[PDB]
Design a binder for these strands. Structure first.
Ligand SMILES: Nc1ncnc2c1ncn2[C@@H]1O[C@H](COP(=O)(O)OP(=O)(O)OP(O)(O)=S)[C@@H](O)[C@H]1O
Ligand SMILES: Nc1ncnc2c1ncn2[C@@H]1O[C@H](COP(=O)(O)OP(=O)(O)OP(O)(O)=S)[C@@H](O)[C@H]1O
Ligand SMILES: Nc1ncnc2c1ncn2[C@@H]1O[C@H](COP(=O)(O)OP(=O)(O)OP(O)(O)=S)[C@@H](O)[C@H]1O
Ligand SMILES: Nc1nc2c(ncn2[C@@H]2O[C@H](COP(=O)(O)OP(=O)(O)O)[C@@H](O)[C@H]2O)c(=O)[nH]1
Ligand SMILES: [Mg+2]
Ligand SMILES: [Mg+2]
Ligand SMILES: [Mg+2]
Lengths: 354, 318, 336, 327, 122, 329
DNA sequence: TTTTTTCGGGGGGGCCCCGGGG
DNA sequence: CCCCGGGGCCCCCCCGGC
């Protein structure tokens, strides 16, 4: 069967367990959906933002929103280059990720969204108010990755055709979003689940999966080892259960992703050997990490938060490390070559620490 | 009035190789070639306004004479010089039969050859070797690094040098005598200083000064012609106190109509050629000037940014 | 017809339809309204902060100048959603500007001023490249007798100096709780919104000069109140909760942790805090308000914290990680 | 050159090199005797070094100089060689070697090799010079370090300026097309970082490794995109979340059974791949993503051949669903 | 359709007139009076000037109350004029203070009517 | 296109003849002398926006020719394609061909030539030089770094300085007489101060002021009207803000800045610029104070150019000023 | 001791198809 | 009625500073 993270995902607003206040707010928004403004759901990753968006769409249109199909749209650049975009669609809504093509997301925004917004949904999709669903929903996933030109294009398309289309954009952070677009959306904060709620969900999965559990403390450790990420907690529970023959014990170790282990080993190496040869080996390790689809910003974040965890360092060294991380995060945000900035950050950290 | 008179830069263009001032060795060598013959393929390089095209045309004329019409093929940037042109028209001209004096050959003058594609230059290689007995090639360029090395190996290099004050003064005095111009030595000194070794600019400035106010003196010369702004930028960047540098930037650059982009680019160039200051300090000043240039290119161009750049430069030079 | 706008979001529903419905932009609305009679409308450059009423103002001006019928034949609107390269500027805009003005009808001439010139509205012109803007220069001047240009932008510095010189500049002021309160109160009364005293003022203060954000917040509060269905008045705390404003208790806890000065404790507290989803911009603004408006600190501390907050805000405006920036700012303040 | 890569090994590669002055001296002396102008034996080596061993260029030099000056002696070699000096553009490796030298950055050497020379050297190859500098700035023994400065601090400063130059490069190659900033880039990416770690090479000049790494990253990203959109109907995440979260668990549900159970686990793996519309090529691509202690190359190469053969045959013999129905 | 109503003998005539100078100049300006139509066009290079002086006798009927000036683009005019048959009658219609010129194509034998309006240029 | 009364003041008052161009006495006299004796060289008018370059060249062309100059000159601008093909074909034919209408020389005006590509400029060199006998070229520019050195060397340079106060006063008087308007002396001084040497700005602001007045017949344009229509700070407001920042505590300075800004919605950028201008006159005893002021204010201006948090920006301005002036003891 | 991104312009190769001639 | 000349788009390939 499917993974436990996906097999037990709630499919309605009434099936949501944690964050009851947000559920009430979404239910309020769904009471009279014919005047729903554009929505921007922001919060930590792995909290259930997309699940809540799907639940709201189901409550607005119906269960048919969960019948999804994948199609391919063709786009042509000014240089005659051809690109293909995979679009997830339902009889009531579409889901797009314009950042898939990179800097060409503006073409998608200016053509596909314009075409959808300029066409009227004449389908007699009888709603809960006795009138057929009129507006069409488009979910722009990973809006934080959109280029500023695409957002500028979206600005007026959001306003001119509000009668025909409503946008539900999901993002993890609002800093990359431009103020004009942020002003055109209703901001919805999605807090991460607490440890108790994560433990309750994990216990529900355990009971449904007939997983032998020595004590409930293991679920507490799993929840505390995820840092609010529910997807990580569920996948970790499944991995631990499989690795222990569905017989989780109080002494069962907590599993960690391979890239996390590599980053921690790199942190230890940096803290131990502060030399140019160590910097060359760190460059090799960074190349290895980056070549396998590990985002540079993620690497920088984990490296910064792992170096600060070392108990051999003093306050001044940690302050210097965090300052260098702050500077080089902006450097990364304003550059193409990530390895250059990562190597510069490692070099500065080695200089200060030594 | 709807009938203009020819400017002195054209009315007094040297028509013989002996009337070209400056680069005595090269001019004498070209005169010897014109008197003897066996003209080799040549590439003449140098800065604008020194007499490369004039020298080439004078040499071709003195070498050919009545056969100049049928023995010279002059192509310039204003004329198409693509691969097809090189492979058809130049080849036909080289293969064309013309009966010339015993020691004369056909001439192909590719003016402004630095604006030619690498493919055309490559197609211009063998035509110069299989037809050297009938046609010779003269190129006139400003940047000599834009001509592919294979062609440079096939031609004699003539690197014209910057004209000195004496040559410009000599030619200007000759023109003054031929036009009966009332002048003051200070006026000629100012004209030479503002010309910066460009004979065309010197002659144009002299003509404008005479036609606008008459007597060629320092006051009249400087009334039309302004001092080179690169020297003003150099002076601003070499000041001791930030107050003096800001004053120079204000009363000499900002209020004279000079744009911020021009000021920053000139500062970058001058600092690049500021031999007096050490290399490291020059590099830091270049970094600051580049930051200011990037700020200006984004639309934030104001006297405040230039003042901050000057303050940072002064802090670096302290 | 009526239902088309009666079922629309409040921001679109209550968009000004005439020039007298603009709340706090009289200094330019008066000029644009007297040009209705003077018939000498100049080239306009509308710049200001987001959500101040530029697009609405220009649309109302066009409606009042031409009318419902002649509008479409006398308006060329181009925004960031259309290709606006140098080729487009040279061909399409130039061609439209070189055409004769459409013939007004008898009804239009009798009921509307029908000015003798057309209008080209380049919205979000700040995104246009410099080359296209330069190409527009002489096109603006040559055909001034038949065409007028309106460039609408947010960052005035992105418009090349020549075009800014050719266009009369109009700055749209921020809509705060002092000049835009009337419009919000009118909207609330029309929508039958029951709110306590000061709730609208709090909404406008949180909006920070954006009336669209205030209208959206009011609509969200009305939806919540209707769903709950107790018949009580909306409270300010609800507005703050719906506006992503950190509770004062958490801010005081952060301040106390910073005062403690321990790096590990601050790091742990920030890690816990970042799990709630609070935006870093709101936290930075609240910290600035708390620190700059406190008498328990000396001049040097305020001088340093102002620059620290400015640097953090500038860094966060580029799309940087919020956790790292917030932790660095808090540590630096703790070491002040 | 890439253009002539088709002629890699389909032809005999005969190499002609720059002829030495010893053989060309005889020809030059013969021409000197023939054409009635003087050329001392000590001048040929210098004249040949002027033209980078181009016999045609040397003959042209002699012909031109003989027009007016019939004597070529040690008194006039300097002027002739300076007027006819050949200027060839250095190639990536040569550019990197020259730039990372501590003699051109000295107070005496800076006059012979000015900042203009370095900036022009950058422009010889403006697409590879910054990459070569970034690749070869950590393999030198410096000789331009300030009192109290160590190698680590110098390399850190060079890396900071390299990051700034990378930002400038991003600005240059954008929609605005800001090529006027190219000179500044030259200083930020190539000249300044080299000036802080300049010295003597401690090894060989290695070619840029970022190009192949970028190609590998693009390949793996395309594979991850294909896998993600093959599983979008059964998962709630993005491609990054799929790589960081789902794949570690998918491995335990797809590869571990073979290691622990054997051939009997083929059915379970087939089932799991069927639940997420996963193909055999998708399985391989997924197994190629793991790094660190999770590398599966040796583990997969160690699996018994019978299990893999049975897995492949059973998958091919079975009918499987489709996620994207390309019409 | 008050000021100018001019029907040609056949659309082929006006077609031929237009093709005679459509590759020389781009923008033309006709000045239709009660005596006929006269147009002067200058080339971009300012080296060639084209002058057409069609007469009243070239039309089946020609009515023009007041002198009316029409500025037009030759590419667009030719493109529109290529939207008709060779056996039809073409009439030019212009109204008060023209903002566009109407080109009406009529075929009595086939009872075919086609309309085409081109916006004039200032 | 009804009449000239339905045109913007920037276009309604475009100098027709060369005698209506003010502030460029030297250039106007020189070009008029050249036209008189018939010694017109290849001209390069370099200057900032709105100084009278396009108007000057158009007036010169109309003076050389009659009212038919439009057909006797080749004027190309950025709005028209000017690639290498255009230079090779159209400009070359125009220069090498006689005049259709008259029997005089020909003028080519390459306005906004700074937007031309380097290849076109390089091709223009020999086109200019060869046909000099019967053709003359005029190039109008705002930035000189975009013009190739060869083109600059081939043309006589004339620099259009920013318009002095005197010419601006004369033109304002002419506009007031034509429009039947009254301008207060302090209003005139404020208008010239905000002009920055640009007459287009003056004309636009004067039109806005006329619009502001209830009845433009009797009412007078006071400085209050200038600041209301331009929405710019008042000198007293800038002085008060600087005094509060430099001589009061943080609370008082913050309150004063907020009150001044909220009184009439004053923008932060305008206040920063005015304070910079005011401090320019200040005689600082330490160079560090001026250096820090300039650097920090430039950084704040750059931050403002991209938006951000306005309150934090104002607090940063206050703190930077206070810290910089703390070094004056 | 080897090998990347984007607009705009320019160049150069490739057809396509109208027109005109036979 | 059929073949040939030569205008016009379409597609691709390479530069970009002093
Ligand atoms: N050595 C010279 N002696 C006398 N006049 C000169 C000399 N050089 C330039 N001139 C004058 O300036 C005018 C132009 O000289 P040119 O030959 O065009 O300079 P140029 O070096 O060919 O310009 P470039 O490099 O193609 S921009 C001549 O007609 C002369 O009147
Ligand atoms: N001056 C105003 N008066 C009344 N409502 C306003 C005003 N300004 C904005 N709004 C309200 O906010 C909504 C949007 O206003 P807009 O005209 O779109 O602002 P904007 O200037 O175009 O924002 P930007 O700079 O393009 S993001 C309007 O429909 C109004 O409901
Ligand atoms: N010397 C002047 N005298 C009178 N009015 C002037 C003067 N200069 C500019 N103006 C006014 O400003 C308007 C524009 O003048 P122009 O000279 O055409 O602008 P411009 O110099 O071409 O702008 P640039 O340099 O291309 S950005 C004129 O119509 C006049 O109304
Ligand atoms: N039991 C339970 N699980 C949830 C809930 N919300 C999210 N999840 C689980 O968390 C997983 C990831 O959620 P997702 O929305 O994709 O994360 P995000 O889009 O990055 O915020 C899902 O597979 C769900 O199983 C909830 O309310 N109750
Ligand atoms: Mg020349
Ligand atoms: Mg808008
Ligand atoms: Mg102009």
């Amino acid at each position: 069967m499917s993974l436990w993270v996906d097999k037990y995902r709630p499919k309605s607003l009434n099936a949501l367990s944690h964050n009851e206040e947000l559920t009430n707010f979404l239910k309020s928004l769904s009471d009279q959906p014919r005047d729903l403004p554009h929505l921007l759901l922001y919060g930590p990753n792995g909290t259930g933002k997309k699940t809540r968006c799907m639940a709201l769409l189901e409550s607005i249109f119906g269960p048919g929103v969960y019948r999804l199909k994948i199609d391919v749209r063709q786009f042509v650049t000014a240089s005659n280059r051809k690109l293909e975009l995979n679009v997830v669609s339902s009889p009531y809504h579409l889901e797009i990720t314009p950042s898939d093509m990179g800097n060409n997301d503006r073409i998608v925004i200016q053509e596909l969204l314009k075409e959808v917004a300029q066409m009227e949904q004449v389908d007699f999709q009888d709603s809960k108010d006795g009138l057929a669903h009129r507006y069409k929903c488009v979910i722009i996933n990973e809006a934080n990755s959109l280029t500023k030109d695409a957002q500028a294009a979206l600005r007026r398309t959001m306003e001119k055709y509000s009668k025909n289309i409503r946008l539900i954009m999901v993002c993890d952070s609002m800093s990359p979003i431009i103020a004009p677009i942020k002003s055109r959306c209703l901001l919805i904060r999605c807090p991460a689940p607490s440890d108790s709620e994560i433990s309750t969900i994990l216990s529900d999965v355990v009971t449904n999966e007939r997983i032998q559990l020595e004590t409930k403390d293991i679920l507490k450790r799993i929840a505390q080892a995820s840092n609010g990420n529910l997807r990580v907690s569920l996948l970790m529970l499944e991995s631990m259960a499989l690795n222990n023959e569905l017989a989780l014990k109080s002494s069962s170790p907590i599993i960690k992703p391979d890239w996390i282990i590599v980053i921690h080993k790199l942190t230890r190496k940096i803290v131990k050997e502060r030399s140019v040869n160590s910097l060359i080996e760190c460059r090799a390790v960074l190349y290895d990490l980056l070549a396998h689809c590990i985002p540079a910003n993620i690497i920088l974040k984990e490296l910064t938060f792992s170096l600060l965890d070392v108990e051999t360092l003093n306050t001044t060294n940690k302050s210097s490390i965090i300052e260098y991380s702050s500077v080089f995060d902006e450097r990364l945000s304003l550059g193409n070559k990530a390895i250059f900035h990562l190597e510069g950050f490692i070099a500065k950290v080695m200089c200060c620490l030594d | 009035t709807l009938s203009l008179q020819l400017p002195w830069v054209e009315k007094y263009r040297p028509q013989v190789l002996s009337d070209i001032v400056g680069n005595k060795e090269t001019i004498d060598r070209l005169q010897q070639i014109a008197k003897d013959g066996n003209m080799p393929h040549m590439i003449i390089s140098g800065m604008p306004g020194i007499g490369k095209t004039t020298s080439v045309h004078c040499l071709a004329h003195e070498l050919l004479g009545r056969s100049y019409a049928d023995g010279v093929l002059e192509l310039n940037a204003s004329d198409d010089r693509g691969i097809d042109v090189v492979r058809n028209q130049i080849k036909h001209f080289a293969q064309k039969k013309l009966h010339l004096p015993p020691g004369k050959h056909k001439i192909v003058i590719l003016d402004e050859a630095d604006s030619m594609t690498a493919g055309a230059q490559q197609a211009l290689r063998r035509t110069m070797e299989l037809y050297s007995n009938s046609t010779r090639f003269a190129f006139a360029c400003n940047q000599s690094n834009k001509i592919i090395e294979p062609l440079q190996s096939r031609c004699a290099i003539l690197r014209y040098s910057k004209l000195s004050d004496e040559d410009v003064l000599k030619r200007l005095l000759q023109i003054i005598k031929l036009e009966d111009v009332k002048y003051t030595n200070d006026g000629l000194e100012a004209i030479i200083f503002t010309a910066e070794g460009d004979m065309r600019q010197a002659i144009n400035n002299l003509q404008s000064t005479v036609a606008g106010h008459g007597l060629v003196n320092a006051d009249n010369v400087f009334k039309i012609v302004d001092s080179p702004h690169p020297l003003i930028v150099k002076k601003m960047l070499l000041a001791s106190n930030l107050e003096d540098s800001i004053q120079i930037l204000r009363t000499d650059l900002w209020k004279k109509g000079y744009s911020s982009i021009d000021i920053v680019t000139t500062s970058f160039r001058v600092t690049k050629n500021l031999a007096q200051v050490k290399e490291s300090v020059r590099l830091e000043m270049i970094k600051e000037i580049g930051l200011t240039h990037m700020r200006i290119l984004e639309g934030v161009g104001t006297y405040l940014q230039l003042a901050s750049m000057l303050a940072k430069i002064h802090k670096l030079n302290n | 017809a009526e239902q088309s706008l009666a079922q629309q979001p409040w921001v679109e529903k209550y968009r000004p339809k005439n020039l007298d419905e603009v709340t706090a932009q009289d200094h330019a609305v008066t000029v644009l309204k007297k040009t209705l009679k003077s018939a000498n409308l100049p080239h306009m450059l509308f710049y200001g902060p987001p959500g101040t009423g530029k697009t609405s103002t220009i649309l109302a001006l066009t409606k009042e100048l031409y009318g419902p019928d002649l509008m479409k034949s006398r308006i060329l609107e181009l925004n960031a959603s259309d290709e606006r390269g140098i080729s487009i500027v040279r061909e399409k805009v130039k061609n439209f500007a070189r055409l004769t003005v459409s013939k007004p009808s008898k009804h239009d001439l009798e009921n509307y001023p029908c000015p003798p010139y057309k209008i080209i509205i380049l919205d979000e012109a700040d995104s246009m490249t410099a080359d296209a803007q330069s190409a527009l220069r002489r096109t603006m001047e040559t055909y001034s007798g038949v065409t007028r240009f309106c460039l609408i932008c947010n960052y005035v510095t992105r418009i090349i100096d020549p075009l800014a010189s050719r266009c009369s500049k109009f700055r749209f002021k921020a809509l705060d709780a002092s000049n835009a309160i009337d419009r919000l109160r009118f909207i609330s009364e029309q929508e039958n919104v029951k709110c306590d005293d000061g709730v609208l003022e709090r909404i406008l203060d949180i909006s920070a000069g954006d009336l669209r954000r205030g209208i959206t917040l009011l609509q969200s509060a009305s939806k919540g109140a209707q769903y709950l269905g107790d018949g009580k008045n909306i409270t300010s705390t609800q507005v703050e909760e719906l506006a992503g404003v950190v509770p004062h208790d958490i801010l005081i806890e952060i301040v106390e942790k910073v005062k403690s000065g321990d790096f590990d404790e601050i790091k742990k507290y920030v890690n816990t805090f970042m799990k709630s989803g609070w935006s870093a911009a709101s936290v930075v603004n609240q910290l600035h308000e708390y620190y700059i408006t406190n008498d328990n600190f000396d001049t040097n501390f305020k001088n340093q914290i102002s620059w620290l907050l400015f640097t953090t805000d500038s860094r966060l405006n580029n799309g940087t990680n919020e956790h790292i920036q917030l932790l660095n700012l808090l540590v630096k303040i703790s070491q002040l | 050159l890439p253009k002539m890569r088709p002629f890699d090994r389909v032809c005999l590669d005969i190499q002609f090199r720059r002829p030495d002055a010893n053989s060309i001296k005889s020809r030059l002396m013969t021409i000197a005797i023939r054409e009635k102008f003087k050329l001392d034996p000590n001048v040929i080596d210098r004249l040949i070094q002027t033209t980078r061993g181009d016999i045609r260029q040397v003959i042209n030099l002699l012909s031109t100089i003989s027009t007016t000056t019939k004597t070529i002696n040690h008194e006039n070699i300097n002027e002739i060689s300076k007027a006819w000096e050949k200027n060839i553009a250095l190639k990536p490796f040569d550019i990197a070697h020259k730039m990372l030298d501590g003699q051109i950055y000295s107070d005496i050497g800076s006059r012979n090799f000015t900042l203009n020379d370095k900036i022009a050297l950058y422009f010889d190859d403006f697409d590879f010079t910054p990459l070569m500098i970034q690749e070869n700035y950590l393999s030198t023994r410096p000789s331009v370090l300030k009192p109290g400065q160590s190698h680590l601090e110098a390399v850190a400063e060079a890396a900071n300026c390299i990051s700034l130059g990378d930002i400038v490069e991003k600005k240059i190659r954008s929609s605005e097309q800001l090529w006027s900033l190219l000179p500044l880039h030259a200083v930020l990416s190539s000249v300044y970082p080299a000036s802080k770690v300049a010295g003597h090479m401690a090894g060989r000049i290695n070619f840029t490794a970022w190009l192949g790494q970028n190609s590998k990253s693009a390949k793996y990203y395309r594979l991850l995109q294909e896998i993600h959109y093959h599983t979008r109907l059964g998962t709630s995440t993005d491609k990054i979340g799929l790589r960081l979260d789902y794949l570690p668990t998918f491995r335990k549900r797809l590869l571990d059974p073979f290691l622990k159970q054997g051939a009997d686990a083929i059915s379970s793996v087939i089932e799991v791949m069927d639940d997420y519309y996963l193909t055999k090529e998708d399985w391989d691509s997924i197994m190629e993503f793991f790094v660190g202690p999770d590398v599966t190359t040796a583990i997969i190469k160690k699996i018994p051949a019978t299990v893999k053969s049975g897995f492949t045959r059973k998958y091919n013999s079975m009918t499987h669903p489709v996620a994207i129905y390309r019409t | 359709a008050s000021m100018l109503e001019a029907k040609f003998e056949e659309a082929s005539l006006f077609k031929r007139i237009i093709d005679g100078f459509k590759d020389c100049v781009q923008l033309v300006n006709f000045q239709c009076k009660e005596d006929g139509i006269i147009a002067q066009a200058v080339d971009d290079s300012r080296v060639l000037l084209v002058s057409l002086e069609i007469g009243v006798e070239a039309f089946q009927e020609y009515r023009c109350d007041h002198p009316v000036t029409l500025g037009m683009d030759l590419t667009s005019l030719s493109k529109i004029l290529r939207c008709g048959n060779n056996t039809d009658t073409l009439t030019l219609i212009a109204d008060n203070t023209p903002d566009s010129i109407i080109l009406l194509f009529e075929d009595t034998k086939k009872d075919r009517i086609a309309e085409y309006s081109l916006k004039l240029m200032d | 296109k009804r009449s000239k009364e339905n045109l913007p003041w920037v276009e309604k008052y475009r100098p027709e003849t060369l005698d209506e161009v003010y502030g460029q006495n030297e250039v106007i006299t020189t070009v008029r002398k050249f036209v008189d004796e018939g010694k017109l060289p290849h001209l390069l008018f370099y200057g900032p926006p709105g100084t009278g370059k396009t108007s000057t060249i158009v007036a010169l062309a109309r003076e050389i020719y009659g009212k038919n100059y439009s057909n006797m000159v080749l004027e190309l601008n950025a709005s028209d394609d000017r690639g290498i093909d255009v230079v090779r074909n159209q400009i070359k034919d125009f220069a090498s061909t006689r005049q259709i209408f008259s029997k005089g020389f020909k003028l080519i005006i390459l306005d906004e030539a700074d937007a031309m590509t380097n290849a076109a400029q390089n091709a223009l060199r020999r086109v200019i030089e060869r046909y000099t006998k019967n053709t003359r070229f005029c190039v109008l520019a705002n930035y000189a770094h975009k013009l190739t050195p060869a083109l600059l060397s081939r043309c006589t340079r004339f620099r259009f300085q920013p318009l002095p106060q005197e010419a601006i006063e004369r033109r304002i008087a002419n506009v007031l007489v034509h429009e039947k308007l009254k301008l207060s002396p302090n209003a005139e001084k404020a208008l010239i101060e905000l002009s920055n040497g640009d007459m287009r700005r003056v004309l636009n602001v004067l039109q806005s002021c006329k619009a502001t007045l209830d009845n433009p017949d009797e009412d007078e344009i006071s400085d209050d009207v200038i600041y209301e229509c331009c929405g710019a700070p008042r000198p007293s407001d800038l002085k008060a803000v600087l005094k509060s920042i430099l001589e009061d505590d943080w609370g008082t300075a913050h309150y004063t800045l907020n009150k001044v800004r909220s009184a009439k919605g004053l923008a932060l950028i305008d206040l920063i610029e005015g304070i910079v201008k005011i401090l320019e006159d200040y005689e600082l005893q330490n160079e560090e104070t001026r250096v820090h002021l300039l650097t920090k204010l430039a950084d704040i201006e750059y931050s403002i150019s991209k938006g951000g948090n306005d309150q934090i920006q104002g607090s940063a301005v206050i703190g930077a000023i206070k810290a910089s002036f703390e070094n004056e003891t």
